[model samples]
Target chain A: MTLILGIDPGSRITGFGVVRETARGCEYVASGCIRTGNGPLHERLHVVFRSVREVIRTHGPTALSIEQVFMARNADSALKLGQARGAAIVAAMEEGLSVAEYTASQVKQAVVGTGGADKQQVQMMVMHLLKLTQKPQIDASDALAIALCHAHT
Target chain B: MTLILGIDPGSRITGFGVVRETARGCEYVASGCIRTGNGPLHERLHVVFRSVREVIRTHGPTALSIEQVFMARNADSALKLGQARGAAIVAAMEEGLSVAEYTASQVKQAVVGTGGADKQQVQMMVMHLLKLTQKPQIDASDALAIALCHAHT
Candidate 1:
């Protein structure tokens, strides 16, 4: 069995999902978002760091999967995204979890059988594959898709 | 009296300088750099986080100062720089130190009397203002200039 945690890091809302995979298939364990309310940049980053650590402590995942950066329209948003991503990754590393990153196309391909899959398609595929009764939130589902991608990879 | 810790964050080398300011003037306490050698992204970020915490513990500064992000030539390097900066800032916030940021021009202007001052001029002025016998390394001097700017601000 391999336990994996996937993180979809954002400046305001960082989504996380945990999964357990065995010879049978992949199983969804948990998924949620860390809402870092508006405040100082340091305080916001601190929230991301602490919330990620809390998730790791609760789940005890051995591996972490995160979305890789594509280009952003502006440098400011990219920098903020990078900071949030860094905080989450540091929390995972502190807990001794191995980190993996997947590009947008890679994740889409793994989850939806196509590199150009849209968000809705990826979500539908994830829900179907994991047998989730209800649709996960967008960010949470994106995180789950990221984890599923890593499992397939 | 206020003790400030300034950081010039980078992916590979994070420079740090500490200073004590009183009604009289500002005085240098210590200065150095944290070298984060090659490793995984998360591992490198972890190194930045830990090294920054160690600096805070050893120096016991009440405030943390760092250079603010400016537009980079490419988004790739900006993302890396942002991550490194995030690691450093999170460390300071975790220690309950107040964080401050200054732009490169602000630092140079504060230290060398011109916003457009060259790196060498900023370094020389930082050395002169702090009464250091020898010039500090480029990164360390930049960090010191940031701290001095914060002090003056």
Candidate 2:
């Protein structure tokens, strides 16, 4: 049994997914989001960093998987997103959890069988794979997809 | 007795300066750079993340003051710098150091007594204030300037 923590980090909202690899496939354990209000920059980073550590501690995940961001909305947004990403990863690192990352396209390909899967396709496939009755929130869906990617690969 | 940690964060190099506010003026405690060699993104961030924490522990700073970056060479570089900045801030925050920030212009105004001070003017003033016979490295100089700003203000 392997427990993995997946993260989809943003400047405002960071999503996390916990999944256990079973004999059949990836089994959903827990998932949620950390919403950070507009505050001082350090305050925002503090939330993302501390929350990730709490998630790891609570779930006792053996490893972490995160989405690797490239060019975001624009240059400025990219910087903000990078800050959030760095905070999350450093938290996991400090928690002694090994971190793995995959691109959006990589996640889509693994989950939807296509590198260019649209948002709807990726989320829908995640729901199908996890046997969920409802579609997960946007950020939560991506985090689970990232978790599945790590579980499979 | 106030000991402050000043940071100038970059993707490849992070500079740090520790200064103590004395009865007369700011006294230099330490100044150095953390050079992150070209490696995996995680590895680079790890170096910056851990070095910053070690700096805080070794110096026992009461507060942290870091440069606030608005822009860099472009959007991509800004993202990289943001990652480094986030890593540094989170490290200090994890160690319970209160964090403050100043823009480059703000640092210049405090250190050189001019908002529009050029790089040369700022460095010259920092040297004069710290009474260093030789010029410090560029990164180290900027970090010292940031520390001095916190010491005065």
Candidate 3:
């Protein structure tokens, strides 16, 4: 049994998904977003790092799946995103998990059978794969998609 | 006696200085740069975090002083800088240090006589204040200047 933790790091809200793999297929264990409220950037960075550690401890995931990069964003936002990611991956490694990275298209291809898929498409595909009766929330679905990509990879 | 840790976080080399504040003045405790080498970004990020933890364990600093931002650099570099800062600050917090941020001018003003002082002035002032016979290296001098700022503040 392999347990995977997938992370979608953001400056304001970071999302995480946990998956358990059996001989049959992948089973969704849990998913949620880390919300560190309005505070100084470094204070929030500390919170993000600690929050990821909390998630890792709660789910006891064996591996971490994350993105290699994001779409074209502004320079300052990219800086903030990089800070979010640094806090995140360190937490995963701190919790004794090997890390893997995937591209947008790579994750999309693994989940939606194509390299180019829209956000709406991602939500539907993740729902179908996870056997959810309703559409998943945006951040949660993205993180779930990332976990699925790790499973498929 | 209070010990302060000042960090100049760089994508390549992170410099740190430790100073002990006595009632008379500040005393030099320790100083050095962290080198994680040319690994993957996330891999090096983890190393940076661990290395700072090592520094905290070694020096037993009571507080942290770091830069508020860098000069105009490229977008990608800003991202990398953010990542480095994130790891550095998180490590300090993890080691039970409260954090402080100061601008280049702020640190310079505290170390030198004026906010408009040059890098060379910073090097000379920090050397004199710490009662060192030799001129400090660039990054180390900068970090020492930062630590002096914390002391003067």
Candidate 4:
């Protein structure tokens, strides 16, 4: 079974989820958030990077998928997102896993049937599609959408 | 001969350089720059991705050596750098190259004698070591440094 990891990277809160293929469908194996508090940006970046490294070391994913940072109105906000993205990318590549990327709207559209769907709507659809009774917290939901995209394709 | 394509990704300009292993050293083969202007950041990133694809196709690099975007004084600057770096990584992987990363200072120290060397010094040393008489322009110099770093290892 191929272990696929999906990541939703943010500066302050990087979210991640993992799934393993089974006879039934993609099975959730793990999920969590990496918090980078208000330290120097570089220090925060290292924290995110370390967290990603730990996840890969622990989970041994065969593949990685991430949400491409789309339009963020604030330039600074977008930049932080990019750093988070890099932290995740570097970690996966170091572990020799193939990486795939999808944009935010694409993740939403894949799970929700429309690119314009709100975050909550995407979350709900993911919970429904995965057939989970409890709503996944924010980071896991974002990761689930990415995982769903990879699974669908 | 193993061919490694090195990229120095920037918000406005991306520098690309290639090195192919030979009896003497990693010989500099083809090196240039890709400049994308202001627009939607994603569109600009697309340009970077396509350009990298073309370079890999044209050069047939066995590996991709990319410079990591470290913390800049300005957060916004660091973010765009990260985006460009991410786009470059995605593009290289999409083109089927195994990617490796080196920090900017590391690349500088590998090419010049010191990590804190001035850009011009590094540029001149890159030209001198590569046996090019003329001084390399800034973008190509940075790209060449990345290639040189991989050559050392």
Candidate 5:
């Protein structure tokens, strides 16, 4: 069985989803959002790194699927986000896991069959596609959807 | 009632304790640690901001008390710790809370009644002073001790 970890990372909330591919298909294992409050940028990054590492250790997943940053609205935001992304990369690399990259649109398209889906729609579709009994109550359901998309791909 | 939210901000684990200055004087309301994992730096900070904000909202804290950054033997360690401190300060300011800073030695003396008391002694005294029935089994008790120090001052 192969496990794919999907991460929907933002400056404030990072949604994470892990799915395992069984003989039947990919199944949702666990998912949640990490919330870091306002603090020193570096400290926050370390927090994120530590939490993500915990999640990985908890699930013992195979590989990480992360969203590539683009059009962050401003260079400052972009730079900071890039640094955060670097932290995630470092976390995975430190664990000796190779990471796979996906864009927002690609993950959404795989799940909702369109690139223009909103967060709610993507989340609903993710739950539906995963054959879960009900929708997950989490801030980053889109993260789950993205992971499911990766599983399908 | 005056409220002080004490924080022990480390690069990995950021500890917090909210104390209420009631008629009975400073009393512990709630306390815990906020953890971020290895991942994107911006996303990690976001997690810290969100978690700390949730802590404040849950406990209705007013002022923030954080430990002063201590210089370490390694320049890299010091620089990293500084970044963590930066995120913590920004988070506090954004919450519109008044902030207080203290050195590690000061907090130790305030809680342990000695400047150079060991961590175990400080933790034992804090647990006794706070009237906690069960001692927590974490090494990061220094953060809670700092909060208890504020209660004395």
Candidate 6:
């Protein structure tokens, strides 16, 4: 069995999902959002790094996947997003986890069988595939979808 | 006396300079560059984080200064720059150092007496102020200038 962690990084919150890949298929292990709350950028970044490390320690994921950067309209917001992404990725790498990136469309296509799938469709499909009792938060579901994509690809 | 660590972060290399500020004036402690040579972006970011930590451990700086984000010509490059900056800042913050940022123009003005001063002028002034026998590398001098700027400000 191989365990994978998926990340959806943001300036304020970062979503994480853990999945265990077996011979039959992928199984959900854990998932949640790390809330950095309101603080200085550097302090918030430290939260991202420490929180990811905590997740890794708890779940023991051997690999990591994250959403790749796409074209963003606002440069400032993009920069903030990049910073969050960097913190998360570095945390994983520092733990010796191999990292991969998937675009939004690729993740959608993998989880929902269509590149044009909406967020709702992706969320519903993730719930159905994982046999989750309750629908996860949007961010958490996105992280799951990304992990599922890595499993398929 | 207070020691300040200043960083000039890039995707490939991060320049660092440390200075000690006393009641009398600023004194140069050490300066160098961290080259994150060829590798995955995440791995490179890890290098940035570790290198900054090593500098802090070696110099024991109480404060940190970095260049603030401004406008960038390309969104992709800006994102990369932001990631580099984030890794560096998080390293300092994790070490319990207070972090500050200065813009390129502000650094030039504080170090060279003109916001529009060229790189060469900034380098010369930094050498003169630090009593260096020879000029430092462009990136290293820029880092020193940033540290000097923080000291003056």
List TM-scores for all candidates, in order.
Answer: 0.92, 0.97, 0.95, 0.59, 0.49, 0.92
Better by lDDT, candidate 6 or 4: 6
CAPRI verdict on model 1? medium
Model 1 whole-model lDDT (C-alpha atoms) = 0.87
Model 4 chain A worst lDDT window (10 residues): A40-49
**Local lDDT at B109 for model 3:** 81
Compared with the true structure, what per-residue lDDT tens digits does model 6 show for residues A19-111?
Answer: 998878899999999898798788899999999999999999989988888886678877888888888888888788988888889999889
lDDT of 5 by residue, A19-60 (tens): 887778778788887777788554566666677778888898
Docking class of 5: incorrect
Clash numbers, per candidate = 0, 0, 0, 1, 39, 0
Two-chain complex of model 3, DockQ on C-alpha atoms against the true structure: 0.75
CAPRI grade, predicted model 2 = medium
Better of 2 and 5 by TM-score: 2
Q: Model 1: residues >4 Å from true position, as ranges?
A: none
Task: Supply the TM-score for candidate 1.
Answer: 0.92
Chain A structural similarity (TM-score) per candidate? 0.96, 0.94, 0.94, 0.89, 0.86, 0.96
State the DockQ, from 0 to 1, for candidate 6. 0.73
How much lDDT does candidate 4 score? 0.77
Quick one: best TM-score, which candidate? 2
Q: How much DockQ does model 4 earn?
A: 0.17
> Please, what is the whole-model Cα lDDT of each candidate in the order they appear?
0.87, 0.87, 0.85, 0.77, 0.67, 0.88
In model 3, the runs with Cα more than 4 Å from the true position are A70-72, B70-72
DockQ of each: 0.73, 0.78, 0.75, 0.17, 0.03, 0.73
RMSD of each: 2.0, 1.2, 1.6, 8.6, 13.1, 1.9
How accurate locally is residue A116 in candidate 5, as Cα lDDT from 0 to 100? 86
DockQ of candidate 5 (2 decimals): 0.03
